[PDB]
Amino acid sequence: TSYDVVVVGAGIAGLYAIHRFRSQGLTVRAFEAASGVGGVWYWNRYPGARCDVESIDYSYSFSPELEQEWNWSEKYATQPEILAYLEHVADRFDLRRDIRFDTRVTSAVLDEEGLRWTVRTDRGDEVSARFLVVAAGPLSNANTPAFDGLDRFTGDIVHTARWPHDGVDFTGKRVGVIGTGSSGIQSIPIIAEQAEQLFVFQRSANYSIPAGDDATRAEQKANYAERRRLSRESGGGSPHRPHPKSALEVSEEERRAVYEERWKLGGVLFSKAFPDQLTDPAANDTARAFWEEKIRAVVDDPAVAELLTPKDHAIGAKRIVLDSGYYETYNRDNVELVDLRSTPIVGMDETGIVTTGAHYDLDMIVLATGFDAMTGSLDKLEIVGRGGRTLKETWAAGPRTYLGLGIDGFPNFFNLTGPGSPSVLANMVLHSELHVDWVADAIAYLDARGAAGIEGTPEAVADWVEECRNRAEASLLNSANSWYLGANRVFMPFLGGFGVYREIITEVAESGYKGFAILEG
Numbered sequence: 001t002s003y004d005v006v007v008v009g010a011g012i013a014g015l016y017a018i019h020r021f022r023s024q025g026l027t028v029r030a031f032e033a034a035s036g037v038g039g040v041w042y043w044n045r046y047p048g049a050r051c052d053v054e055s056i057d058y059s060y061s062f063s064p065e066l067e068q069e070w071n072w073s074e075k076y077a078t079q080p081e082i083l084a085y086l087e088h089v090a091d092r093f094d095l096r097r098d099i100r101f102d103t104r105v106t107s108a109v110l111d112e113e114g115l116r117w118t119v120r121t122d123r124g125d126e127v128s129a130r131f132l133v134v135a136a137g138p139l140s141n142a143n144t145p146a147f148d149g150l151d152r153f154t155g156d157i158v159h160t161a162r163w164p165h166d167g168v169d170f171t172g173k174r175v176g177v178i179g180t181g182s183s184g185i186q187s188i189p190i191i192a193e194q195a196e197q198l199f200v201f202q203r204s205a206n207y208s209i210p211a212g213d214d215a216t217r218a219e220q221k222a223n224y225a226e227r228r229r230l231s232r233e234s235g236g237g238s239p240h241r242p243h244p245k246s247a248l249e250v251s252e253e254e255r256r257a258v259y260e261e262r263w264k265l266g267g268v269l270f271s272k273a274f275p276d277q278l279t280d281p282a283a284n285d286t287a288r289a290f291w292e293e294k295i296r297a298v299v300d301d302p303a304v305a306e307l308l309t310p311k312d313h314a315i316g317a318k319r320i321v322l323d324s325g326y327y328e329t330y331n332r333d334n335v336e337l338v339d340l341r342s343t344p345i346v347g348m349d350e351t352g353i354v355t356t357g358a359h360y361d362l363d364m365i366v367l368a369t370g371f372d373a374m375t376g377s378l379d380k381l382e383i384v385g386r387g388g389r390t391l392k393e394t395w396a397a398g399p400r401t402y403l404g405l406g407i408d409g410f411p412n413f414f415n416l417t418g419p420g421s422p423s424v425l426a427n428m429v430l431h432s433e434l435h436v437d438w439v440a441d442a443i444a445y446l447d448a449r450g451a452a453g454i455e456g457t458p459e460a461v462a463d464w465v466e467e468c469r470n471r472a473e474a475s476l477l478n479s480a481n482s483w484y485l486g487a488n489r490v491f492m493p494f495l496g497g498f499g500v501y502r503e504i505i506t507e508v509a510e511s512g513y514k515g516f517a518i519l520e521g
């Protein structure tokens with residue numbers, strides 16, 4: 001029942017945690033709510049689920065052998081391939097024996113005399129950890145929206161968050177998709193190709209750009225070490241940089257050519273084509289205009305194109321979706337886009353969806369749900385720190401951390417890749433590696449000095465909260481209805497760049513953890 005580390009989650013972060021911590025001789029017990037490893041890549045298996053960041057970059061760097069040995073089948077790996085990859089990883093490093101699956105951690109209570117966390121589970125587990133590491137992921141399922149008479153619909157209801165492992169045949173079916181976030185945008189084109197008829201029920205339109213040899217694949221494998229260095233020192237965790245000159249300080253021909261080149265290689269990277277693209281509203285207007293043009297050129301019907309165009313949002317404010325044949329899908333005879341602002345859904349009946357203006361005969365409804373950002377999973381845990389104060393309570397006015405890694409009243413607790421860190425703003429595999437490594441060094445630091453614990457300082461967290469506030473007040477990611485916002489106004493991620501952030505937390509470590517108190521037994 002005693003372990004050095006308890007890890008919550010068995011996705012990318014938790015799997016690396018187990019490996020890294022055991023390599024320095026720590027005993028580890030991990031809990032995973034799911035049936036197998038993989039996290040988001042295990043749970044989220046709707047058709048066309050796919051990563052945003054090139055798989056060369058969105059993959060582990062910790063093992064030279066694994067990098068050379070594993071062959072990615074395409075530029076942006078789909079969910080089943082990333083799953084197979086993470087399964088291979090648990091196979092190679094014998095991680096599963098230290099994981100208990102189908103087990104949801106419910107509470108963690110600090111014993112302040114001992115500086116241990118007692119971790120409890122819905123399967124009746126009670127374990128004592130020196131260190132609690134939460135690797136619960138940054139994305140959790142947004143609530144299934146309550147529709148009147150959904151329980152009366154005779155056809156099939158399928159949720160993108162709980163996709164049938166053996167798939168769903170859409171052949172011969174009239175299909176209604178509700179939700180046009182990424183899970184919708186990625187599944188729609190596949191649904192339309194085999195469905196008899198597809199109705200897409202859209203509330204808000206989102207920004208999405210296209211996804212897009214043997215001799216060239218062996219070229220990056222030999223240059224992998226240099227590509228990782230660039231990534232670890234970059235702003236977003238990939239070997240890329242923005243243009244030198246400003247958006248509003250270049251030719252139109254040079255503008256179109258820079259946007260066109262950045263249109264090809266990725267959506268997250270298109271957002272950072274120009275330095276002031278996510279800072280100056282007028283600069284963003286150009287990227288917005290360039291995007292609208294491209295979509296009007298591909299969509300046949302100008303009325304549909306307009307409906308596909310996001311109302312009045314800065315491009316990049318919400319993360320740009322990566323699509324494969326999405327906008328082309330609306331040229332098909334068997335797909336109709338229904339504007340929910342004109343005709344809102346007022347309920348379901350036996351035979352389909354009823355809106356304000358028409359009834360829709362359907363055999364199948366696909367609920368393409370979204371994701372809550374950053375605090376969703378942590379919020380389902382009761383973490384009781386010093387004085388018996390929960391993390392939920394101390395975060396009531398917004399997340400407070402130092403570096404994302406320290407919180408006063410929570411010694412020996414580490415929340416990975418969450419509020420206070422770049423989090424989803426950076427390549428999350430490399431971010432996981434950075435954070436797990438940092439935690440492991442901190443533990444090694446404590447062990448070499450006979451110290452019982454480490455704890456965020458009230459002063460350092462206040463300074464960090466302010467630091468995150470300042471980097472964010474400038475950005476267009478800090479919009480009123482922003483994906484990235486917390487309790488209050490609080491923009492949750494660190495917005496200064498991955499390389500900058502990595503530099504900060506490493507120098508903090510090298511200085512003997514200034515801003516943390518080192519605690520004696």
Ligand SMILES: Cc1cc2nc3c(=O)[nH]c(=O)nc-3n(C[C@H](O)[C@H](O)[C@H](O)COP(=O)(O)OP(=O)(O)OC[C@H]3O[C@@H](n4cnc5c(N)ncnc54)[C@H](O)[C@@H]3O)c2cc1C
Pocket residue numbers: 008009010011012013014031032033034038039040041044049050051052053054058103104105106135136137138139182377380381417424426427428429432
């Ligand atoms: C379609 C899609 C594409 C994406 N593409 C990219 C990309 O290209 N680049 C990128 O950087 N990020 C991407 N992401 C973000 C993705 O969330 C992260 O990259 C990744 O999940 C981080 O891994 P993780 O281990 O931190 O979290 P997760 O993969 O979410 O793993 C967390 C695990 O913890 C478990 N857990 C949570 N709470 C508990 C509890 N109380 N008890 C037990 N277990 C618990 C969960 O079941 C889950 O298995 C994408 C997400 C989606 C949905």
